[PDB]
Structure formats: structure tokens, C-alpha cells
Amino acid sequence: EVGVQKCKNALKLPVLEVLPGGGWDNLRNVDMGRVMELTYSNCRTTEDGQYIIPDEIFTIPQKQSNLEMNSEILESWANYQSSTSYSINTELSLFSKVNGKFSTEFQRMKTLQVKDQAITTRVQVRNLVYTVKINPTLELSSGFRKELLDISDRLENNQTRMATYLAELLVLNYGTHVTTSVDAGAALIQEDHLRASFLQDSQSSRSAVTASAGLAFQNTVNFKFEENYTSQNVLTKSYLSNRTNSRVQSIGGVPFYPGITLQAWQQGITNHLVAIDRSGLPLHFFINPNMLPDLPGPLVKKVSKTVETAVKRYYTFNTYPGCTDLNSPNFNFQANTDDGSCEGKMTNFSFGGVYQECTQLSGNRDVLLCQKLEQKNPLTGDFSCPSGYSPVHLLSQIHEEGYNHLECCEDVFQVAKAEFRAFWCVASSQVPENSGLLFGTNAQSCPAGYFPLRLFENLKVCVSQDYELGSRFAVPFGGFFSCTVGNPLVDPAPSLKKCPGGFSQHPALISDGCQVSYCVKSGLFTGGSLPPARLPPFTRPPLM
Amino acid sequence: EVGVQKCKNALKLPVLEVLPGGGWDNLRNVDMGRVMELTYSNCRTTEDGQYIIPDEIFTIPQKQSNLEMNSEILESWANYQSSTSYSINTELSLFSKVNGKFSTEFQRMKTLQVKDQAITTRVQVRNLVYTVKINPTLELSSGFRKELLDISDRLENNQTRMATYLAELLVLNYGTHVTTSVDAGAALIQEDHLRASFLQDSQSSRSAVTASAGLAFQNTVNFKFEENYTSQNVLTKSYLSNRTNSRVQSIGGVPFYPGITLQAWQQGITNHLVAIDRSGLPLHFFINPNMLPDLPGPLVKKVSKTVETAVKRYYTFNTYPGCTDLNSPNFNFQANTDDGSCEGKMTNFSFGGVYQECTQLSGNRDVLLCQKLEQKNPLTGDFSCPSGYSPVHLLSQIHEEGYNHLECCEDVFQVAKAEFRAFWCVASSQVPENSGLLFGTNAQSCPAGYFPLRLFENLKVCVSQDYELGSRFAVPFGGFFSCTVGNPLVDPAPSLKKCPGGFSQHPALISDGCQVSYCVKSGLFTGGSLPPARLPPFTRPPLM
Amino acid sequence: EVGVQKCKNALKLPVLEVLPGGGWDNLRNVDMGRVMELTYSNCRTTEDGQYIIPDEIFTIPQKQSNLEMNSEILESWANYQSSTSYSINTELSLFSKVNGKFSTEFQRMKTLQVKDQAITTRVQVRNLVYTVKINPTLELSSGFRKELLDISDRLENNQTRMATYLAELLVLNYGTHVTTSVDAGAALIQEDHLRASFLQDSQSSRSAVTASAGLAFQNTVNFKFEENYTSQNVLTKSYLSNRTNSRVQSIGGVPFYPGITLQAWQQGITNHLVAIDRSGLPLHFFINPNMLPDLPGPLVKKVSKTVETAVKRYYTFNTYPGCTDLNSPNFNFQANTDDGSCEGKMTNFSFGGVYQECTQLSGNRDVLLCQKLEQKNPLTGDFSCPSGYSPVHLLSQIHEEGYNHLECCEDVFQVAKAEFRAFWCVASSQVPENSGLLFGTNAQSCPAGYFPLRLFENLKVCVSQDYELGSRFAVPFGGFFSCTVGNPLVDPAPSLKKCPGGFSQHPALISDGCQVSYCVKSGLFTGGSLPPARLPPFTRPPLM
Ligand SMILES: *[C@@H]1O[C@H](CO)[C@@H](O[C@@H]2O[C@H](CO)[C@@H](O)[C@H](O)[C@H]2NC(C)=O)[C@H](O)[C@H]1NC(C)=O
Ligand SMILES: *[C@@H]1O[C@H](CO)[C@@H](O[C@@H]2O[C@H](CO)[C@@H](O)[C@H](O)[C@H]2NC(C)=O)[C@H](O)[C@H]1NC(C)=O
Ligand SMILES: *[C@@H]1O[C@H](CO)[C@@H](O[C@@H]2O[C@H](CO)[C@@H](O)[C@H](O)[C@H]2NC(C)=O)[C@H](O)[C@H]1NC(C)=O
Numbered sequence A, B, C: 001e002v003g004v005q006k007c008k009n010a011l012k013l014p015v016l017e018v019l020p021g022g023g024w025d026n027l028r029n030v031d032m033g034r035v036m037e038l039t040y041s042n043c044r045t046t047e048d049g050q051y052i053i054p055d056e057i058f059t060i061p062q063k064q065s066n067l068e069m070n071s072e073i074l075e076s077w078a079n080y081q082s083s084t085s086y087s088i089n090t091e092l093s094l095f096s097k098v099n100g101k102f103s104t105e106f107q108r109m110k111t112l113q114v115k116d117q118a119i120t121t122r123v124q125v126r127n128l129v130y131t132v133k134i135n136p137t138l139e140l141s142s143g144f145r146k147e148l149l150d151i152s153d154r155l156e157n158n159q160t161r162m163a164t165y166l167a168e169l170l171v172l173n174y175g176t177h178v179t180t181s182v183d184a185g186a187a188l189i190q191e192d193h194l195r196a197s198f199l200q201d202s203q204s205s206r207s208a209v210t211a212s213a214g215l216a217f218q219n220t221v222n223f224k225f226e227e228n229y230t231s232q233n234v235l236t237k238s239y240l241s242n243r244t245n246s247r248v249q250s251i252g253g254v255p256f257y258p259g260i261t262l263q264a265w266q267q268g269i270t271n272h273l274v275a276i277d278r279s280g281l282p283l284h285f286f287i288n289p290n291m292l293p294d295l296p297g298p299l300v301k302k303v304s305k306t307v308e309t310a311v312k313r314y315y316t317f318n319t320y321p322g323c324t325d326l327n328s329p330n331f332n333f334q335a336n337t338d339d340g341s342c343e344g345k346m347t348n349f350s351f352g353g354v355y356q357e358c359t360q361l362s363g364n365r366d367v368l369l370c371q372k373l374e375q376k377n378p379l380t381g382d383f384s385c386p387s388g389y390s391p392v393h394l395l396s397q398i399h400e401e402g403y404n405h406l407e408c409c410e411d412v413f414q415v416a417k418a419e420f421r422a423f424w425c426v427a428s429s430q431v432p433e434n435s436g437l438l439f440g441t442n443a444q445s446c447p448a449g450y451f452p453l454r455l456f457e458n459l460k461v462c463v464s465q466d467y468e469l470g471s472r473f474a475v476p477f478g479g480f481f482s483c484t485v486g487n488p489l490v491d492p493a494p495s496l497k498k499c500p501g502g503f504s505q506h507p508a509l510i511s512d513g514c515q516v517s518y519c520v521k522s523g524l525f526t527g528g529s530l531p532p533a534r535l536p537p538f539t540r541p542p543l544m
């Protein structure tokens, strides 16, 4: 045809295999989408005469190299460097303590450092070879344009809750940032871990331990399968006995195997390139009146706002407070950001129960969903909390449902609205251990003897009334907090939204705009593997 | 086609891969943009007959070389040489102590010298090969022309605050200087660090320590993987035991590996060239009536002024005073420029609180934003500071917001204006330790017990009222200073804008024209990594 | 095309890569511009038949060579030889003690000789191969012609201060001299430094120390990487222990590495040539009535005068008097020319202050700039110097500013003029140490306690009133001198323009025609790196 293939039949050259203009998810370092365009218009080459480039980029060669002889120690896993995306993870002073905390590389480092009390160590060979950018005169792609008018067309007829669902679908396909800088090259990076007690017993030889690791790295590369290397004489015997694991990885060129020299690895560095860092801008910056020609003036300033709150919602859902200091008790694993809420003693409390009733405000006739909302108290029954309830609001939203009506041969569809709220009970002033509720396997069910019952259409947290077997798996309760109201149990919403000292928060049942939570000291809820990131959508689409 | 490709099909020669005319960011040594043009008009070569050049440059060959046998010691990290941009970082006697203080190379040298009390050492091989320039008869590019009329078209209709936003967008894409000189070549530079106590114990052998380092550098290059080199006999045993780390880097030719001779490295020096220094002029010099033909006379002299204040604003935001001497107490890390404000004892003070109220000057009806501005005192409440307030001004600006009105089928858009100011409270004359405020993890929240509340729509600095747990994380307060007014607490705005001896300034919440600050002696706010540079824009765009 | 490329397709020969006719900056040995022309008119070759030359030059071959066996000692860094530009740096008996004092080569020699009490030593191999010149029948270039009529067109309508700005723009782009002689060739030059005490202890063996250095230079070239060379037997052991550093550089041919014989270096000397000396004439000599045809008679004699004063102004700005003898106290580093003002004892003085007022001579109405000029005394206030003022003039010039007036739909632009002068105070006859002013980090601010305030719109030199902390960083004041008036404090403008014995001058705030100065004995202002040359422009352009 005519296009990309026309240039390769006239010059006999490869194409550069790394371009900017794509999207970039920021909290998971992975690429998707093409938010810009590139058209192989006429013909172009790099000035060295080795590649074929698109029409609007420009390259400036650097041809650098690096080789270090001493490894370095980066501690304190709450702040780290990713060695493949470093210029893009620190910019703009945004909510950046959560940034980069869900990569494939980060979750393997945190799992290693907490099991055997470890600190890490790395040594690399860089070999930078290029740097490309983009000129500021640019257009959007054909794909990104067709789905950008759609969020404007559903917004010009005044439909809130119908554009925010289309907005959160845009972050899933095109990421949060737009990378406009890259640089090709290779690397050869050899990570290592060491025990914590080894680093402290000989502090004066801190320049002598890392000097051995840089010498041992060149013996793994430059020698063959056997062991004729000279590090096994004096000091590497107290080494090689406190390291837990190590791995050598390479992100460029021919695949690495122990036995090639350093000469032969850098010889075949051409035609195998990848980005080793990048930098860009947020997504709410490329929605400009200069960028979109035909859309009107004061309408594109609202599109740039409604896509900003979606990517701000994506940052505030999957974030977790809690303690992070390793030597203290109640060390809350599965917690990325620090809170400083450690060193707090605990005091027990008491809980009453929960019973739900339906309201049915705007449903006059032909509405049958009120008895689905029903849930009674397992201790008393009807509208009589034992002694402890005092009114909070905690929730207000609408649950809709639609039905097909037969009006006759021809059918018109209509829906009905409602309103719902639940209740809760707690200890009143001072009631002794008698008439106390015991609160609750990797199952859908509670342990034996306990009985669960529904709360909010998908979750189950159990209530039980026994005093011989119920203390086998009982956990003390801390208190709910929510989107607007705060926890009244703290400070013995005028207060803040957290949990008192000695407990740990947990997420539960996000529902249409913001989520609710609870906290409970268990010691067993914290264990397990690390959770993946919670991806959008969040709000279910209204059905017109 | 016809153009660049027409010349290469008739001569069979490469193209020179380094040209002037691009932009150059000055405080981060990196390149972007093409503020000049080059058109491959007819045909040209260099007079040696090895490259193809643009139509308006001229090259003068030099063919130099260098090789030194003794390394040198550059101390005092506040002033340094970058070895890749030296002729451009010292010119014009501008605000140049901040110049070059945010490169990739500089931030790695400062981190090494402060951890282990180090001084550096380098030895290089230069091999200069060319020097190109530009003739003074020149035009602007097509891209730079189209975005230069736009800052004139929005200025001819008298819109201040709408051109300064377009001005600060120009510094982001095209840098602060314009490089018109380069010189191709290579290098081979081997940095090294040494302890501070080693250099002082034998001062008479200062010509003998550096003579060994120059001999050891040629053994790493010219010999193979093993160790048959003759430096391990007499004096290198007291060496190789105080060095912390070292790295060999090369910025030209084939990639470096230990084992090539010095002969084979300089043989393949052709077709791999890069700039190793450069020099240029500021950006407010290439806006001239001779440069732009069609724009009128006394209008281009205003464009050259409004782009000068933007690049002067970019230099004065990211700069930090504070102490820099390493041996003294309160050593303020993360501080580039010196102040001389060390050796000052400290005295505690007391702070009262902060409460905010809205004004609503020009909003008669249909304006609902006044209660968003509300913030009350956590100690007293209404308009009654305890004993200490005395009026300062500290701020005056406008907060705008717009709303879509329905005038009917057809919609016209209009906005509303306002004015705001906050308040503050401090100790009056002499009040004892009773009724004193305790002032405040890498989180959005304060530590436990403390409560934060909003100040200026994005920041939070906490107030707390307790006297048992509040002293766990209390910090003494120093005083605010701002854009126009000064700190009255100094000299125990007629005074200057700084903080008394023993504290350290910090930036906070830049808002529309200049920023405010505070200072607090912590000992823990200074630690951490180095911050990246704060890039423009600064002023949010008005919405017409 | 037809031109340069037509000759190379018929003869298959290279082009000579070094031509005269360009410009030449004299105090910085670097090249720019093409003030003459060369047109490859018909065809030509050198008579040997190896190169292609322009139409109006002529070459006379010499084919010389040199090789010396004994190095030589050049002392006294105030006068030196540059070894690449020697015939052009000594001519015409002009202001030549400042000539060549700002090269890249000179600033590295002065830094080495002052740190370790050193004297230099060199030995070279010359190999001259050609010499070209230009016939006196010649034309100007197309580029230099178009910018030469412009300085005449703005001069024929009687605009002083509008042509001198265009004159100083010509020296920036085309240098001060015009080189019309060169000679191609190579070199191989090996510099060296030695201690000062080694040369004096054995004066009788002065022919024996330099005889060893010439023998050791041929062993570095002609032998391989190892050490099988025979200089390590008798006398080189008391050598190689007082040298500080050495470097081998080469400015022609293939790049140098230790290991090629002297045979192989001179074999590939073809097609790699550069100038190793040159000589020319000043720039005010090529503006002649025979040179420019169309311009009238008595008008070109004024153009030759107004460009002579600009290049004389460029020589007198960046020049510094002061002491230069190394063994004496108050050794003023950063001083190129000698003054002989050493060996002078010192006596303290006292200073009063400075207060400024505006005049507003020719501004009747709509002029608002007078209160910007205001600056009051920090000690007394209004028009009352304490006891010491006596009138001098010291300054007279005009500060202009323009404003856009709305006369209506149509706008005409007009400016307003003024006049300004500052004041100063000093000790009267004999006042004791009471009521004395203490006069003042690499910052914009003074040290702590001190307060700065504005003097002349860009500079700040501080005044302070304290007697406990102010003596921490106090410096004694010497006295101002200026363009026309002299210092009255000397000879205890009828006197000269200098500073009494024991102090050191410094430049400050050049403003529109000539600069002012001051002097202060510090001991700390002299330290630091060497400053670069101050480039033109100097006078800001009037705005018509
Ligand atoms: C445009 O959208 C707004 C909501 O953003 C609608 O305003 C609501 O109007 C109803 C009655 O018409 C009120 O009961 C609601 O309280 C309003 N919402 C709010 C948040 O106050 C408005 O009706 C819509 N207009 C059209 C033509 O659809
Ligand atoms: C972990 O490293 C420590 C060093 O910090 C090792 O402890 C030393 O081992 C040597 C080897 O024989 C002994 O001579 C020392 O007496 C040990 N103690 C100290 C305080 O130096 C330790 O052996 C390593 N761990 C394991 C499992 O080998
Ligand atoms: C041109 O811009 C100036 C501001 O630079 C405008 O001057 C303001 O005019 C209003 C009333 O018209 C005054 O209340 C303001 O105080 C003025 N500004 C200042 C800084 O004094 C001027 O109105 C503009 N003219 C046009 C036609 O838009």
C-alpha cells in the first residue's frame, strides 16, 4: 500500500520501536492507548541515518554510558526508586505517596523485606543511547476524538450521573497521564537482599562490604559456568551466608546468560531498544480550546473539570492508612501510607445490633420492592433498640428499578424511585458484660454457631448471641465511619474520619459516590497476600 | 521526495548529528524545541568532505585532543563545574548561584558528599573535533512564529492576566536560553570520591596521591579483565580503603567496556558525535523589530518585556535560603543557596490561632460561595482573638467562579467576583506557658490526637489543644512572611523578608502572583530526598 | 548545482579546510563571522595539485619541520606566549597587556601557578606545511554589506545614541580584528609544571634538568603501554616527585594515543590541517572609500570613527588594576594588569550614609516615577547629613520611560524625560569611634542583623547600625571613584582615579557610558574563580 510500507521499500531501514504519545497508568506502571497521532506523511530519518521516524517528533542523540564499581543501599520501603520510571513518579507534588505502590516490581520487594528483616542492594550498567520528544503543534488521534465528543454530547443536554459513568470509562482505557518524553537504551541490573543485623555490626567497613558486591557482579558476567573467580579468599565467606535471594535481570539487547563477556553484550545493542525512563503531564491538561477546534468555548472548560474529579476519585479509593513500623506490636501489614497512629493502648466496647426498614417515598402503586429491604433485629425485633441509639445520618441515596408494562400491542417502559436507610445499636452509657454481643475462614459464611444476615445487598458481617462457644472466634468492635459523618467513639462531623489507637481500618461495600468502613483489632485479618488495585467503574449506569 | 533525501541520493554521505538553534533549559541541563529554522536549500558539505550541513551555518575545524596524567580536586559543592555545560552556566553575571542546581548530575554529587564526608576527584580525555556556529542573518521557525503572534493578538486588545498565562506556557516548551555555539567530540571521564580525613593527614604528598589515580585510570582502560597491573606495590594499599564509590562514564563513540585499548576507542570516533559544551544568549534578546517583519514598532517592545518577567519569575520560585555549613548544628539539608544565617541561638514563642470569614463585595444576588470560605477559631469561636492580634494586610486578590444561567432555549454565561482575607493570632506581650497552643508521617493527616482544618483550599497545618499527648509531636513556631509584608518577629514592611536565627524557611501554597511561607525548627522536616524543580504554569487561566 | 560542487565532480580532490578572511576576537582567541567573501568562480588548484582553493588567495609552500631535544622555561605569567596565536597578540603596540588574558588556555595556566608555587615547561614538534594570504583587490561579503549600510542610514539623519548601540552590536558578531594570514600544519605539545624551590637549589645543572625532560617526552611517544624505557636510572628519581601535573595535547592529524611511533603520526598528516598561527589588522582599517563604492565621501570617515570608539570601549571595561606580587601580603588574585600599588600601609576611615531624592525637571503632568527614586537616610532621615558632606558632581544622565495614551479609537505614543542624582556622607574632620557606620555569602542578601536598601535600581550594598553583632562581618571603606571625578581621599578632578595603598578596586553597576567603582580591603572578596569576559551591549536602546 501507500504509507508505512512505502518508506521501507525505498530505504531498507528499520523503524524506531519506541514512541511517545501513548497513555500511561501512573499507579500501575503499564502502558495502554494512543492519545496522540502519528502519520508517516512524506519521509524522514534520524540524522545518523539508521531509523525511520514519524512526521512530528525530533531526536537529539546523547550516546552516554555508565558503569559503577560499588553498590548502594536504599532502605525504608515506604519511599523507593523504580529504576524504569523515576522521572514520572515524583512530579507535581500530587498525592504521590500512593504513586507507584501497585507495580509488579514493588509488590515483590515489600514481600521480601518483611519476611526475613531485609534491606536491599543494587548495581547497574546503564548505556543510554537516545532521547526523543514531541513538538507542541499536535492533533488528537481518530480514536480519542470519537469518544471525546460523546462525553460532550451527553453533557449538553444536562445529564449528570450519565456523564460521570462515561468519564470513569475513559480512565480505564487511556490511563491518567500522557507521556511526552522517552529515551531508548538497555540496562543490566542485579538486585540483592541482606539481613538487617549484618549491616549494623560492622559500620566502619561500610565502604568494604559494598566494594565486594561490585567485584562479585563482574565475575558472574565475565566468567564461564565454573568457579575460577578470585573473590573466595578473604571477606566473601562472612558474605554469602546472610543473603536471602538475588536475581539478575536485563531489559535490553540479546537475552542475558552467565558467560557472555561485557564486550559481546554491548555489541548487539542495535535494533533492540526500550524506554528506561519517561516523563509527562496529567490528563486534564490536554483538553484545551486550542486542541479541539469545533467544540464551543465555555463547554470544554466543564469537560476538563468532570474528567479531573474522576482521576481524583481513582486515587482516593485504593489507599490505606495504618501503622507501618515493623518492630512494634499490631504491625498492620497491607498498608501503604503511614498514619502515625501506633503506640496507642486499647479499651473494649459493646455493640447492640442492626435492623432495617424500607421507606417507599415516591412509589404509589405497582411497586413491589419494599419487603426486599426488610431486616429485623436478632435480639429484640421491632423498633426498640435496647438502650443505646442516638441519631446519625450516615447515608442518603436512591435505589431505582424498572419494569415492563403492557399498555394495550405496544409497550412503554417506566421506572420507580425510592429511598432507604439502615439503623445501628451500641452500648448506652455503662452496661456490664451481661447481654453483650459477640461480633464476627475465607468463605461466604461465618464460623460454626454464628449466624449471618444481610446488610446492604452484597456484604455479610455476622451477629451472634451465645456465651459458651461464641468466644471462640469473637472480635472486639471499633466503630463505623463514612463519607460525611465521623466516628463519635474517638476523642473521649465535628471530629475527623479515622479509628482510635490500637485498631486498623478496612474497606467495605463501596456504593455510588463514596464508601463506608469499619475497624476491628483482629491480628488475623491483616495476614494474607497483597490485594490488586481496584479498577473503575464505580457507579452503575442509570437506565434512562 | 525533494529536500533532505535529494542530497543523500547524490553524494552518499551522512548528516551532521548536532546542530545549534534549539532551545535550552538553563537550570535543568536538557534540550527542547527548535526556535530557529534550517532548510536544506540547494546542497552543501563541510570542507573536509564528510558531512552534509544545513544552508546557514559554518564550521571551523580544530581537531584538538587532550590527555592528562594527574587528577584534580574540586571541593565546595556550592560551586562546581558540570563538564558538559560549562561555557553556558557562568555567563552574564545573572542569578547564577541557582544555575545548574537541578540537573541529573548535580543531585547525585550532593547526595554522595553529605553522607560520608566526601570530596570528589576526576580525570578525563577530551578529544574535540569540530565547532559550528550560525550566521547572524536568520529567520524564526514556522512553529515558533505561529505561537508568537498569539501572544501579540491577545495583547493588542488589553487583556492582562490572559497574556501572562500564555507567556509562562512559552517557557515550558522552549526553555530560557537559545544555544548558538556547539562543538562535537567525545570524552572518557572517571569520577571518584575520597574521605575528608585522608586528604588532611598527608598534605606534603598531595602531588603523590593524585599521581597514583592518574596511573590507575590507564590500567582500567588498557588492560584486560584480570589484574596484572603494577599499581599494587607501594602506595595504593593505603589507597583503595578510603574511597566510597567510583564510576566510569563516556559520552561518545562506541560504548565503553574495560578491555579495549586507548587505540581502538579513538579509531571508531567517526559518525558518533555529541556536544560537550555550548554557549548562548537569553530569550528576551531574539525578539527584535529586525526579527519580526510585520508586527508594528512599539508593540514588539512590550512583548519583549512581558516574556522577561516570566523567566525571571521562574528563577525566583524554586530557590531556597538557609544554612549550608556541614559541621555546625541545625544543618539544613535541601538548601542550595547560602544565607549566612547560622550561629544563632533560639527562643520560644507562642501562637494563638486562625479564623476565616468571607466578604462578598461585588456579589448581590445568585451568589452562593460565601459559606465555603468559613473557618472558625478552635479556641474561642467568633470575632474575639484572646489578647494578641495587631493588624497586617498580607494578602489581597479576587476569587472568581462561574455559573450557567437559563434565560428563556438560549443560554448566556456570566460570572461573579469577590474578595477574601484570613486572620491570625499570636502571643500579646508576655503570657506564661498556660493556655499555649501546640503546633504541628508523610500523610494527608496530622498525628494522633491532633486535628487539622482548612486554611486556603489545598493545604493543612494543624492546631491542637492538649497538654498530655500534644507534646509528643509539637514543634515551635517561628512566624509567617509573605510577598509584600515582612516578619515582625525578627529584629527584637520596614524590615526584610526572612526568619530569625535558628529556624529554616519552607514554601507553602503559591497562589496567583507570589507565594507565602513560614518557618519552624523541626530537625525532621529537613530530611528526605531532594525535590524536583517546580515547573510552570503558576496562574490559573481566567475564563473570559 | 553549479558552484562548489561543480569543481569536485571534475577533479576528484578535497577542499582546503582553512581560509583567511574571517573575523577574530582578540582578547578571547576564538573565531566568528566572514567579513570577506570567496566565490569559487571558474576553477583553481594549488600548484602541487592536491587541493581546491577559492578564486582570490595565493599559497606559497614552505614544507618546514621542527624537533627540539630540550624543553624551555617561560616564567612570569603576566607575559606569556599562547603557542597557537603568537603573531597576532603582540602587534601594533596597542593596549596589549590585556590582550589574550581571557582565553581557555590562559585561565588554566594562572590557576595552576598560584596554587602550588609553580613554573611551567614545554616542548613541541611543529611541522609547518603551508602559508596562504589574500591579494589586496577584494570585496566585502553580502552579509557584512547589508549591516554596514544600516549603521550609515541611521547616521545620516543625526541620531546619536541610536548608532552607538548598533555599533556595539557589530563587535559582538564580527570581532575586533580581521585575520589575513594563516599557515596549516600540526603540533604535538607536552606541557609540564614544577615546583619553584626545585629550580633554585641546583642552578648549575639547569642544562641537565631540561635535557632529561626532552628525553622522557620521546619515551612517552615512541614506546608502548608498559615501562621498558631507560630514563629510570640516575636523575629522574629526584624528578617525578616535584611535578604537580602534566598533559599532552595535539592539534592536528589523527588523534594521539601513547603507543604510535613518531613515524606513523607524520604519515597521516594529509587531509587534517588547522591554523597554528595568524596575523591581521584592526577593524577600523577596512572601512575605506575604495572599499565601499556607493557611499559618499565625507560620510564614511565618520563611520570609521564611531566603530573605533566602540572597540576601544570594549578594551577598557574588562581590565583590572591591583597588586600582582605573589610573596607579599594582600595578594590581589583576580587581577590581570599590574599597578605597582603594593607595599602601602593602611589607615581606617568612617562613612556616613546615602539618601536619594528625585528631581523631575521636564515632567509637568501625567508623570508618575518620582517616588520610585526615593531613598532616605537610615541614620537621620531628611536633608541633614550629620557633619561631613562637601559637594561633588559624580553623575549626570537622563532616565526615560514611556506610556500608552488613549486619545479619542487611535493611539499615539509619547515619552517623558527626567534627571537624577544620589548623595553620600563621610566623616567630617575628626570624629571618634562612637556613631560610626559598619559597612558590608554569595547571596542577594547581607548577613544577619544587617539590612540592605536600594541604591541604583540593580545593586545592593548594605548599611548597618549596631555595635555588638555588626563587627562580625564589618569591612573598612575606602572611597568611590568614577568616570570624571576622582577620589579625594587619596593624596593626604585634580588628582587621579585610583585607590590608596592597601586596598583593591572592584567594578559595580555600569550605567550608560562609563562605570563607577569602589574599593575595600576584605581578604575574602578576592577569592573565588576567575570571571568570564563581559560582553557587549552596554547602552540600552532608546525607543524613538
Ligand atoms: C438540569 O440539571 C439540574 C441538576 O443539576 C436540575 O435541577 C434540579 O431540578 C429539580 C426540579 O426541576 C429540583 O427538584 C432539583 O433539586 C434540582 N437539582 C438540584 C441539585 O438542585 C434541572 O432541573 C435540570 N434541567 C433540565 C432542563 O433538565
Ligand atoms: C550473619 O552475619 C553475621 C555478621 O554480622 C555473622 O556473625 C559472625 O559470623 C562470623 C563467622 O564465623 C563469626 O566469626 C562471628 O563471631 C559472628 N558474630 C559477629 C558479631 O561478628 C553471622 O554468622 C551471619 N549469619 C549466619 C547464619 O551465618
Ligand atoms: C485597559 O487595561 C487597564 C488595566 O491595565 C484598565 O484600567 C482599569 O480601568 C478600570 C475602569 O475602567 C479601573 O477601575 C481600574 O482601576 C483600571 N486599572 C488600573 C490598574 O488602574 C482599562 O480599563 C483597560 N481598557 C479597556 C478599554 O479595556
Ligand SMILES: *[C@@H]1O[C@H](CO)[C@@H](O[C@@H]2O[C@H](CO)[C@@H](O)[C@H](O)[C@H]2NC(C)=O)[C@H](O)[C@H]1NC(C)=O
Residues within 6 Å of the ligand: A204, B195, B197, B198, B199, B201, B202, B238, B241, B242
Ligand atoms: C583512611 O586513610 C587513613 C590515612 O589518612 C588511614 O589511616 C592510616 O592507615 C595506615 C594503614 O595501615 C596506618 O598505618 C596508619 O597508622 C593510619 N593512620 C594515620 C594517621 O596515618 C585509614 O586506615 C583509612 N581508613 C580505613 C578504614 O582504612
Ligand SMILES: *[C@@H]1O[C@H](CO)[C@@H](O[C@@H]2O[C@H](CO)[C@@H](O)[C@H](O)[C@H]2NC(C)=O)[C@H](O)[C@H]1NC(C)=O
Residues within 6 Å of the ligand: C158, C160
Ligand atoms: C543634530 O544633533 C545635535 C547633537 O549632536 C543636536 O544639537 C542639539 O540641539 C539642541 C537644540 O536643537 C540643543 O539643546 C543641544 O544642546 C544640542 N546638542 C549639543 C550636544 O549641543 C541637533 O539639534 C541635531 N539636529 C537635528 C536637525 O536633529
Ligand SMILES: *[C@@H]1O[C@H](CO)[C@@H](O[C@@H]2O[C@H](CO)[C@@H](O)[C@H](O)[C@H]2NC(C)=O)[C@H](O)[C@H]1NC(C)=O
Residues within 6 Å of the ligand: B204, C195, C197, C198, C199, C201, C202, C238, C241, C242
Ligand atoms: C623537591 O625537589 C627537591 C630538590 O630541589 C628535593 O629535595 C632533595 O631530595 C633529595 C632526594 O632524596 C634529598 O637527597 C635531598 O637532601 C633533598 N634536598 C636538597 C636540598 O637537595 C625534594 O625532596 C623534592 N620534594 C619532594 C616532596 O620530594
